[PDB]
Design a protein around this ligand. Structure first.
Ligand SMILES: CCOC(=O)C1CCN(c2cnccn2)CC1
Length: 284
């Protein structure tokens, strides 16, 4: 039985290596990674890989790994796929922990924009969780943390992390992680997956996919929102992505909103993530 070596980048930045039979389905590898991570609430997570166009793709757990990575390396990342709107409802602290690690990368990467004060508050909770109580012996007036907190670090932000860390004395890691999540879950881009697109007049927009529905960003002014219940059918064809939008009470007919994606694979990827979000958040 021939086995392929898999390398998975974990949310702490470490590399997990394992082997699976070369005709394995994605679920096989994902089960090995989740066991390694002692993760039981696996439904919120998945593995990503980079396709021949260098686009992030979700590894479909029901399909052969080889028919997805195709010509590429068996290299993956472990990631949050479905961001829970209320992380307090998760059953296990360790689940909340992995969600914190993902969110920390969302913030540092700039995928999750955040005010100065919220960057410092989230950072202060991370430090409390990881180092415990504020120790002056560690930090002087020139302190810079090893922790990456933000897309652009400033001395002012380091100072504010320390000021807020001082306020958290006696806070346990689970408690600090829950506070982290209570703040992060409120940010306008929390759990929003952004896709570049053009509207039916060729005007560049972003489509965001999240728990509450599909968001259309025309810019920072005029954001259209389609709650999952107002969406009846999602489809792609060639480079085009279509959603059916319900008739408003006493309306005879659904409306169609069409988008142009960069290429056919980008349209299909957007369709699959929308269908998965629609299903997941219909049941939550
Ligand atoms: C370096 C990665 O940066 C991002 O993902 C940001 C995310 C936020 N943002 C938005 C927000 N709404 C509509 C359109 N774009 C700019 C791109």
């Amino acid at each position: 039985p021939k086995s392929m070596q898999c390398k998975v980048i974990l949310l702490d930045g470490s590399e997990y290596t394992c082997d699976v039979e070369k005709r394995s389905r994605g679920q096989v590898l994902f089960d090995k990674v989740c066991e390694h991570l002692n993760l039981l609430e696996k439904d919120y997570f998945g593995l990503t890989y980079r396709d021949a166009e260098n686009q992030k793709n979700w590894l479909d757990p029901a399909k052969e790994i080889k028919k997805q990575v195709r010509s590429g390396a068996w290299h993956f990342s472990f990631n949050v796929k479905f961001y829970p709107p209320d992380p307090a409802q998760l059953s296990e602290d360790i689940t909340r922990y992995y969600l914190c690690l993902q969110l920390r990368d969302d913030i540092v990467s700039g995928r999750l924009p955040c005010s100065f004060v919220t960057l410092a508050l989230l950072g202060s909770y991370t430090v409390q969780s990881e180092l415990g109580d504020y120790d002056p012996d560690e930090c002087g007036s020139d302190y810079i943390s090893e922790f990456r907190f933000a897309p652009n670090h400033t001395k002012e932000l380091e100072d504010k992390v320390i000021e807020l860390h001082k306020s958290h004395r006696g806070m346990t890691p689970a408690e600090a992680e829950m506070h982290f999540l209570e703040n992060a879950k409120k940010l306008s881009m929390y759990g929003v997956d952004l896709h570049h697109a053009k509207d039916s007049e060729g005007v560049e927009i972003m489509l965001g996919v999240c728990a509450s529905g599909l968001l259309i960003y025309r810019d920072r002014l005029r954001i259209n929102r389609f709650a999952w219940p107002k969406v009846l059918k999602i489809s792609y064809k060639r480079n085009n992505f279509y959603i059916k939008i319900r008739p408003g009470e006493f309306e005879q007919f659904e409306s169609t909103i069409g988008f142009k994606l960069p290429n056919h694979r980008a349209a299909k990827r957007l369709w699959k993530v929308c269908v998965e979000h629609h299903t997941f958040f219909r049941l939550l």
